Design a protein around this ligand. Structure first.
Ligand SMILES: Cc1ccc(C)c(N2CCN(c3ccc(C(=O)O)cc3NC(=O)c3ccc(Cl)cc3)CC2)c1
Ligand SMILES: Nc1nc2c(ncn2[C@@H]2O[C@H](COP(=O)(O)OP(=O)(O)OP(=O)(O)O)[C@@H](O)[C@H]2O)c(=O)[nH]1
Ligand SMILES: [Br-]
Ligand SMILES: [Cl-]
Ligand SMILES: [Mg+2]
Ligand code: NA
Lengths: 123, 997, 209
C-alpha cells in the first residue's frame, strides 16, 4: 500500500470534487477516508484519500504551505483550494479541488488540522 | 483515412480493406478503434450494403467481417425481404444454406468458427420465418435427411431447430403478428412427429457428446410447448433420468430438461403417469447420490470452492428439487417405500440452503415457505417432516436479515413463524442455546448477536402469552448478563441496541406488565443522553415503535401512579431531549403526538397538545416578537435554523395527530403566513443583489427550507382534516394570499414546486367548496409553470411532476375552472396534456394520458352544448393524432396500455354517434357524410403519410379491425401490437387484422 | 497484462454509461447522453492476486443508436445486463438482451444489475426479479448514484474469470507525492481559475457527504 512508513495525524470522511474548465462544473473524484499522513523519515505531511470499496486513490499530494482553503458559495461545510502536484491518477497534475464533509464542525476541524500540517511542512 | 474507402460504394468493395477495418475495430485501441467502429456502423447502415454480402462471405478471410455481413443480411430479411423477386429470395436462401453445409463439412472450421456458424443458423431461421412452410415445404424432411450424412451437420441441425423453436414459441409474442405466430406454431406442431423421431434416435444412438448436448439443448426448448405424450409414452424419461445424469457433459442440460418435464401439463387421475413421475425423480436422485455427491455432502464448502461448473450445477439442482417437490411431493407422502426418497430430496434442499449465496437462498426459501404453509394447514403431514423442520429452524435463525431488507425479512419471518407454530419447544431450545453460545464466547460476534436478535424478534405473537412471558424474560435476562460481561462501549452498545430491538418487538409482554414498560421507557430516556454512535437513533426509533403499539398505556392513569405517564414524559421533555440532534427531537415529539391522539376527550387532548408544544411555542413567540420588531434578525443563520426546527416539530406532531392538530395550527397560522411573506422578501432581495447563484447559498437554502416546511405543515394538516368547513373558512383564503402571487412573481429558479404539491392537496380535499380559489390557483401557476417545463424534457423535474398532478386533480374536482379559461388558455391546456404524452418520465406520461381520458369524460358529461361541440371540432383530431404518434414512434412503450385506452375511447365516441356536429369543415366531403366515414378517411390518410411503405389494403384492414374492436380493450390492444409489428417491415399480410382466437 | 472483454447491455437510460464512468473517474454524470453504438474504456482493479483489466464495451440500448448490435458481443469473456428498478419495461427486455448475448457468447459469467435502487418509488419489486435463477446469472441491486453494491458486479466477475473465490480488491500502492515548486508566471492564471470554481456551487448540497 506504501503507508507503513507514515503516522495518521487526522482521519475524516469526505467527498472530493475537481473543477473542469471545459464544462463550468464540479465532478466528484471520490468519497471515503481523507487522511493526513506524516512520513516518519522526512516529517512531510500529505493528504491521501481512498474511494469506498475499490480503495482507489482519489487524492495524493503534499499539504503545501502556499495552499489556501477558500469557501465555496454553495456550502458551509466545504473548502476549495488549487493543488499544483496531485499524483492520484499517476502523473503530477494541477487541480482545483473542493472537499465536502458531513458537518460544518468537520470542515472547521479539517481546516485547523490542514494549517497544523502546513506548519509541520514549513520546518 | 484509408479505412473510409469501404463507405465509397461507387467503387467495388476492397474486401482486404474491410478485413483491416474489422481487425482495427476488434483488435485495435483508443482513437483507431473508435474510427473503425464509426466506419463499420455507416457501412452496415447503408441500405445497399446487403448487395455486398454474397461478395464478403465468398472472398473475406476474416470471420468477424462475415459476422457483420450476416447482420446486414438479417436487417434485409427481417425488414425488406418481400420487395425481392422470388428468384433473388431463393438465391439468398441457397447461398446461406451452402455456407452452413460447407462450414459443417470442414472439421477445422466447424470446431473453431462456432460464432459464425451460429450466426449463419440464426440468419437461416430469419429466412424460415419469412418463407416456411408456404414457400419451402421440404425444409424439415431435407434437414432430417441431411442429418444422417454427417455428425457435424446433424449437430448443427439441432442448433437450427432450437433457434427455430425459440423464435416461434419463446420470442414470437413481441416480434410477430398474432396471425403469423399462430401460422408458424401450427406449422412446427404439424411437423414435430418427424423432428422428435430424429431427436429420440440421436439420444438412443449416442456416442458424440457434443451432438448429444446440442440435441438435449433443443429438447429443453421443445419442452416449453410439446404435449406430455412425447415424454411419458416414449423411453425418453428413463434416458434423461438414468444415462444422461451419469455423464457430466450432459448432466447440466438434462437437469434443466427434467425441471421443464416437471412443469408439463399432465393428466391428474392416471396411476401409471403418477408412477412414471415418481420413477424419473427416484432415478435422478439415485444418479446424484452415486455419481455426484451423497445426501451428507457439505454443499456450502463445494459451492464456496467453485471448481468447474459446480455452482451452476448446485443452482440447477435447487431449481429441479424445488420445482418437482412443489408440484409432486404428495406423490411421495403416502407410500412408505417412497419415504426415504422424499426425505433424501428434502435433505439435499437443507444442504443447498446452507450455501452462502443470497439468490440461491431466496430460491430455496420460496420452496420452504410453500412447504411449511402446507404443514400448517394440511392434516397428518407435519410428522413426516419433523427432522427436516428442525434443521430448517437452525438454517433460518442463522440467516435472518435485518427488517430493513423488507422482502427477504418478510419471507424469513413467515417461514420461522410457521416453524414456531409447528414446534415451539424446538424453536425456543435453538434460540436459547444460540444465546448460550453468545454468552460463553464460542459463536460471539456483532453479526451473530444481531442475527439472533432479529430472529428472536421475528416470532413475536406465535407463542401463547404464558410461554411468551417466560421466553421473553429468559432472553432479556441473558442479554443483560451478556451486556455486563462485555468490555468497551463498542460491544456494550451492540448488546444495548439488541435489547432495545427485542423489547420493541414484544408489545404484548409490555402491555400486560406496566412496571416493566415504565422501566423500559425510562431506560430509553437514559440512552437518549449516550453520544456513542447509533444509540440515540435506536433509543428514539424504539421509543416511537413501543408508543405505536402500547400508546393506550401512556394515556390512562396506571394504578399506583399520580398521573398518566404522558404528563410525566411532557414535564421532563426539555431534560430528556437536551442531547438529541434536531431530527431525533422531531421523532420524540411525533411519538408524544401518537399518545395524545389516544385521548378522545377534546378538552384534555387540547391541554396535552398545548403542554407538548410549550417549548416550540415559546421559542416561536419570542422569535415572532423580535422578527416583527426587526426584519434584519431573520438574516442570522442561527435564527433560520431555530425557525425551521420549530416548523419541523409542528410537522412531526401534525403527522401523528392529523385532524386533532388543528388548535396548535390555529395558534401559529397567521404569524406563520406572515413569516412565509417576510422570508419570500429576503429571498427576492438576495437574488436581486447576488444573482441566481444566491439560490445555492446556505442563507437562501435555509430561508427556502422555512417556506417548504410551512407548505409541508399546511399540506399535512389539510390532507388529514375532518372539519373541511374550517379549512375553507379559516385556512384557504390566507394560504392562497400568502403563496400564489409570491410563486407567480418570482423568477423560475426561486419558485418552490412544493407550492404546486400543497395546492394539489387543497384541490383534492376542498376543491368542490372553493371554485373561485381553484380559478385563482390556475391563474397563478398555470402559464408561468408551463413556460418553465415546455422547452425540453429535463429542466425543473419537480415542477414538471407536481404541475401535471395539479392539472389532474383540478380536471377531476373543479373542471369548471377550465370552462372559465379564455380560448387561448384552454388551447395551452390541450398543448400541455399532449406535451405530457411525449414525456419519458413515467410519472408525467401517465398523468398526461389520465388527464386526456378524464377531460374527454368531462366533455362527454356536458352533453350536446356549444362548448362540447367546439371542443370536438377544435381538438378531437389533435388527441387522435397525438395518441397515434406516441403509440407508433417506439420511444413511449411504457404508456402503451393507457395510449390504447385513450384511443379506444376516441374511436368509440365516433362509432356510437356520441359527437353531435360534423368533424369535417364545410365543402371538404359530401355534406351528408357520417363522422364514422370521415374518421376512416382521416386515419387512412394520416397513417399513409406517416407510414408510406404500407399498402392501402394494410391500412384499411387495420382501421376496419380497430373500429370493430373499440369495445374490447384486450383485442384492440392486440390489433395495435399487430400494427406495430407490420410498420417495421414491408409487405405485411392485411388478413392478419382478422385474427380471432 | 491480464485483460478480459466485458460487454455491458440493457435498455436506454438504465445507467450503463453512468455506472462505467463512476468506475473510470469517480464522477456521477446526471445528464443522459445516449451512447452511439459502443464506447470502449479500459478499467483496472488491484486485487490480492495482482491487477485485473476489463476491456469494457459499453453498448447503446436505444434501437436507433444500436450500431453493430450483437457484433459488439464477439469474444466477450463476461457481461453485465442492466435494467432500471424504476422502469418495468427495462426488466421485461432483460430476456431479449440475454437472448442476443448468449447466442454469441455461450459460456460466460454474466451479472444482472437492477440499477437506481436509491429512488424512493421502485417499480420492479424484489419478488418479481427471478429471471437470473434458471439462467445462472448473478444478480445485484445497485445504484451508480448512491454507490450501493457498485463494486459487486466487477468483484464477482473477477472471481469467476481468475477462478479464485477469495479474490479481494486491495489498496493500490500510494507513492510519496512530489514537492510544491510553484511558478510566479502562472500566479495570476491560478487566481482566475480558482475565482470561477469558488463561485460555481458544488452539486447535491443535501447529500450526507
Ligand atoms: C442495558 C439495557 C438496554 C436496554 C434496555 C431496554 C434495558 N432494560 C433495563 C430494564 N430491564 C430490566 C431490568 C431488570 C429486570 C429484573 O428482572 O429485575 C428486568 C428488566 N426487564 C425485563 O425483564 C423485561 C423483559 C422483557 C421486556 Cl419486553 C421488558 C422488560 C430490561 C430493559 C437494559
Ligand atoms: N437516480 C439515479 N439515476 C441514475 C443512476 N444511474 C444512472 N442514472 C441516470 O440515468 C440516466 C441515463 O444514464 P446512462 O448511463 O446515460 O444510461 P445508458 O444505459 O448508458 O443509456 P444508453 O447509452 O442509451 O443505453 C442519467 O440521467 C443518469 O444520471 C442511479 O443509480 N440513480
Ligand atoms: Br423461477
Ligand atoms: Cl392495549
Ligand atoms: Mg450509455
Ligand atoms: Na465483531
Amino acid at each position: 500500500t506504501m503507508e507503513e512508513d507514515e503516522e495518521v495525524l487526522y482521519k475524516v470522511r469526505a467527498k472530493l470534487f475537481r473543477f473542469d474548465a471545459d464544462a463550468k462544473e464540479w465532478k466528484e473524484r471520490g468519497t471515503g477516508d481523507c487522511k493526513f499522513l506524516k512520513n516518519k523519515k522526512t516529517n512531510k505531511v500529505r493528504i491521501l484519500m481512498r474511494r469506498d470499496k475499490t480503495l482507489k486513490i482519489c487524492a495524493n499530494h503534499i499539504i503545501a504551505p502556499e495552499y489556501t482553503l477558500k469557501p465555496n458559495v454553495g456550502s458551509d461545510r466545504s473548502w476549495v483550494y488549487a493543488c499544483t502536484a496531485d499524483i492520484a491518477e499517476g502523473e503530477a497534475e494541477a487541480f482545483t479541488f473542493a472537499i465536502r464533509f458531513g458537518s460544518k464542525e468537520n470542515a472547521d476541524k479539517f481546516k485547523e488540522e490542514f494549517e497544523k500540517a502546513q506548519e509541520i511542512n514549513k520546518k | 483515412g484509408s479505412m473510409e474507402g469501404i463507405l465509397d460504394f461507387s467503387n467495388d468493395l476492397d474486401i482486404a480493406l474491410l478485413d483491416q477495418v474489422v481487425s482495427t475495430f476488434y483488435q485495435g485501441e483508443g482513437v483507431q478503434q473508435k474510427q473503425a467502429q464509426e466506419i463499420l456502423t455507416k457501412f452496415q447502415d447503408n441500405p445497399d450494403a446487403w448487395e455486398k454480402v454474397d461478395q464478403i462471405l465468398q472472398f473475406s478471410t476474416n470471420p468477424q467481417s462475415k459476422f457483420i455481413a450476416l447482420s446486414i443480411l438479417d436487417k434485409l430479411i427481417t425488414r425488406k425481404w418481400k420487395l425481392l423477386p422470388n428468384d433473388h429470395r431463393i438465391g439468398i436462401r441457397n447461398f446461406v444454406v451452402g455456407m452452413i453445409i460447407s462450414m459443417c463439412q470442414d472439421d477445422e472450421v466447424f470446431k473453431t468458427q462456432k460464432n459464425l456458424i451460429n450466426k449463419s443458423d440464426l440468419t437461416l431461421v430469419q429466412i424460415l420465418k419469412q418463407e416456411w412452410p408456404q414457400n419451402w415445404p421440404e425444409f424439415i424432411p431435407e434437414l432430417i435427411g441431411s442429418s444422417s450424412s454427417s455428425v457435424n451437420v446433424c449437430e448443427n441441425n439441432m442448433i437450427v431447430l432450437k433457434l427455430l423453436s425459440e423464435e416461434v414459441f419463446d420470442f414470437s409474442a413481441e416480434q410477430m403478428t398474432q396471425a403469423k405466430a399462430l401460422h408458424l406454431k401450427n406449422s412446427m406442431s404439424k411437423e414435430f412427429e418427424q423432428i422428435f423421431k430424429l431427436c429420440f434416435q440421436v439420444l438412443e444412438q449416442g456416442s458424440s457428446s457434443s451432438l448429444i448436448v446440442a440435441t438435449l439443448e433443443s429438447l429443453l426448448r421443445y419442452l416449453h410447448w410439446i404435449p406430455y405424450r412425447y415424454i411419458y409414452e416414449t423411453n425418453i424419461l428413463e434416458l434423461l433420468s438414468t444415462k444422461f445424469m451419469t455423464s457430466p457433459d450432459t448432466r447440466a442440460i438434462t437437469l434443466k430438461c427434467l425441471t421443464e418435464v416437471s412443469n408439463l401439463k399432465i393428466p391428474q387421475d392416471n396411476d401409471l403417469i403418477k408412477r412414471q413421475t415418481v420413477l424419473f425423480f427416484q432415478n435422478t436422485l439415485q444418479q446424484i447420490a452415486t455419481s455426484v455427491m451423497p445426501v451428507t455432502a457439505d454443499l456450502k464448502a463445494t459451492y464456496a470452492n467453485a471448481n468447474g461448473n459446480d455452482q451452476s450445477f448446485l443452482q440447477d439442482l435447487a431449481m429441479f428439487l424445488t420445482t418437482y417437490l412443489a408440484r409432486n411431493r404428495a406423490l411421495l407422502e403416502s407410500d412408505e417405500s417412497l419415504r426415504e426418497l422424499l426425505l433424501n430430496a428434502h435433505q439435499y434442499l437443507i444442504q443447498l440452503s446452507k450455501i452462502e449465496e443470497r439468490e440461491l437462498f431466496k430460491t430455496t426459501l420460496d420452496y420452504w415457505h410453500n412447504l411449511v404453509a402446507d404443514l400448517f394447514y394440511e392434516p397428518l403431514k407435519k410428522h413426516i417432516y419433523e427432522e427436516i423442520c428442525s434443521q430448517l429452524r437452525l438454517v433460518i435463525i442463522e440467516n435472518m436479515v435485518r427488517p430493513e431488507e423488507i422482502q427477504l425479512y418478510k419471507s424469513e419471518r413467515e417461514v420461522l413463524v410457521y416453524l414456531t407454530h409447528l414446534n415451539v419447544i424446538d424453536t425456543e431450545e435453538i434460540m436459547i442455546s444460540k444465546l448460550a453460545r453468545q454468552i460463553d464466547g464460542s459463536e460471539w460476534s456483532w453479526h451473530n448477536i444481531n442475527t439472533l436478535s432479529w430472529a428472536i424478534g421475528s416470532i413475536s405473537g406465535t407463542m401463547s402469552e404464558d410461554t411468551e412471558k417466560r421466553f421473553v424474560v429468559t432472553v432479556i435476562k441473558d442479554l443483560l448478563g451478556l451486556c455486563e460481561q462485555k468490555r468497551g462501549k463498542d460491544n456494550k452498545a451492540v448488546v444495548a441496541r439488541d435489547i432495545m430491538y427485542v423489547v420493541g418487538e414484544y408489545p404484548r409482554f409490555l402491555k400486560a406488565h406496566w412496571n416493566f414498560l415504565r422501566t423500559v421507557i425510562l431506560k430509553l430516556f437514559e440512552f437518549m443522553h449516550e453520544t456513542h454512535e447509533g444509540v440515540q437513533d435506536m433509543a428514539c426509533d424504539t421509543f416511537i415503535k413501543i408508543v405505536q403499539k402500547c400508546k393506550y398505556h401512556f394515556v390512562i392513569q396506571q394504578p399506583r401512579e399520580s398521573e398518566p405517564f404522558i404528563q410525566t414524559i411532557i414535564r421532563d421533555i426539555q431534560k430528556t431531549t437536551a442531547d438529541l440532534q434536531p431530527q431525533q427531537v422531531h421523532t420524540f415529539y411525533k411519538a408524544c403526538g401518537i399518545i395524545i391522539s389516544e385521548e378522545r376527550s377534546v378538552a384534555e387532548r387540547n391541554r396535552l397538545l398545548s403542554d407538548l408544544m410549550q417549548l416550540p411555542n415559546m421559542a416561536w413567540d419570542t422569535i415572532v416578537e423580535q422578527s416583527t420588531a426587526n426584519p434584519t434578525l431573520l438574516l442570522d443563520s442561527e435564527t433560520v435554523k431555530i425557525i425551521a426546527n420549530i416548523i419541523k416539530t409542528n410537522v412531526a406532531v401534525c403527522t401523528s395527530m392529523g385532524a386533532d392538530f388543528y388548535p396548535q395550527l390555529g395558534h401559529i397560522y397567521y404569524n406563520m403566513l406572515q413569516l412565509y411573506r417576510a422570508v419570500s422578501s429576503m429571498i427576492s432581495t438576495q437574488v436581486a443583489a447576488e444573482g441566481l447563484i444566491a439560490t445555492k447559498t446556505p442563507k437562501v437554502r435555509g430561508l427556502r427550507t422555512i417556506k417548504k416546511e410551512i407548505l409541508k405543515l399546511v399540506e399535512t394538516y389539510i390532507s388529514k382534516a375532518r372539519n373541511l368547513d374550517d379549512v375553507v373558512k379559516v385556512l384557504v383564503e390566507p394560504l392562497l394570499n400568502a403563496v400564489l402571487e409570491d410563486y407567480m412573481n418570482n423568477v423560475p429558479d426561486a419558485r418552490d414546486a412544493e407550492v404546486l404539491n400543497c395546492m394539489t392537496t387543497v384541490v383534492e380535499k376542498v376543491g368542490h367548496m372553493i371554485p373561485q380559489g381553484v380559478i385563482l390557483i390556475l391563474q397563478s401557476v398555470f402559464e408561468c409553470t408551463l413556460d418553465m417545463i415546455n422547452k425540453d424534457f429535463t429542466e425543473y423535474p419537480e415542477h414538471r411532476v407536481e404541475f401535471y398532478k395539479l392539472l389532474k386533480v383540478i380536471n377531476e374536482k373543479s373542471f369548471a375552472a377550465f370552462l372559465e379559461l379564455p380560448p387561448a388558455a384552454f388551447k395551452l391546456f390541450v398543448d400541455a396534456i399532449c406535451w405530457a404524452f411525449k414525456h419519458n418520465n413515467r410519472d408525467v406520461e401517465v398523468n398526461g394520458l389520465q388527464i386526456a381520458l378524464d377531460l374527454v369524460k368531462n366533455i362527454e358529461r356536458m352533453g350536446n352544448v356549444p362548448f362540447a361541440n367546439e371542443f370536438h371540432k377544435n381538438y378531437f383530431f389533435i388527441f387522435v393524432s397525438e395518441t397515434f404518434f406516441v403509440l407508433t414512434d417506439s420511444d413511449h412503450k411504457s404508456g402503451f396500455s393507457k395510449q390504447a385506452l385513450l384511443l379506444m375511447k376516441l374511436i368509440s365516441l365516433v362509432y356510437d354517434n356520441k359527437i353531435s356536429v360534423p368533424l369535417y369543415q364545410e365543402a371538404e366531403v359530401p355534406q351528408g357524410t357520417s363522422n364514422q366515414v370521415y374518421l376512416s378517411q382521416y386515419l387512412a390518410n394520416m397513417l399513409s403519410n406517416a407510414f408510406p411503405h404500407l399498402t392501402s389494403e394494410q391500412i384499411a384492414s387495420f382501421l376496419s379491425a380497430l373500429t370493430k374492436q373499440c369495445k374490447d380493450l384486450v383485442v384492440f390492444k392486440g390489433t395495435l401490437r399487430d400494427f406495430l409489428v407490420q410498420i417495421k417491415e414491408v409487405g405485411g399480410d392485411p388478413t392478419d387484422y382478422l385474427f380471432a382466437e | 497484462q491480464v485483460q478480459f472483454k466485458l460487454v455491458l447491455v440493457g435498455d436506454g437510460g438504465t445507467g450503463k454509461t453512468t455506472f462505467v464512468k463512476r468506475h473510470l473517474t469517480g464522477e456521477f454524470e446526471k445528464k443522459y447522453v445516449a451512447t452511439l453504438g459502443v464506447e470502449v474504456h479500459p478499467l483496472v482493479f488491484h486485487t490480492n492476486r495482482g491487477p485485473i483489466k476489463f476491456n469494457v464495451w459499453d453498448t447503446a440500448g436505444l434501437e436507433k443508436f444500436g450500431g453493430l448490435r450483437d457484433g459488439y458481443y464477439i469474444q466477450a469473456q463476461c457481461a453485465i445486463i442492466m435494467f432500471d428498478v424504476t422502469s418495468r419495461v427495462t426488466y421485461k427486455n432483460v430476456p431479449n438482451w440475454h437472448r442476443d448475448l448468449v447466442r454469441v457468447c455461450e459460456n460466460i459469467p454474466i451479472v444482472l444489475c437492477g440499477n437506481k435502487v436509491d429512488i424512493k418509488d421502485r417499480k420492479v419489486k424484489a419478488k418479481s426479479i427471478v429471471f437470473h435463477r434458471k439462467k445462472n446469472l448473478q444478480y445485484y441491486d445497485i445504484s451508480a448514484k448512491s454507490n450501493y453494491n457498485f463494486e459487486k458486479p466487477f468483484l464477482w466477475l473477477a472471481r469467476k474469470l481468475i477462478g479464485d473465490p477469495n479474490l479481494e480488491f486491495v489498496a493500490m500502492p500510494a507513492a510519496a507525492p512530489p514537492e510544491v515548486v510553484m511558478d510566479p508566471a502562472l500566479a495570476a492564471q491560478y487566481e482566475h481559475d480558482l475565482e470561477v470554481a469558488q463561485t460555481t456551487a458544488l452539486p447535491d448540497e443535501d447529500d450526507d457527504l
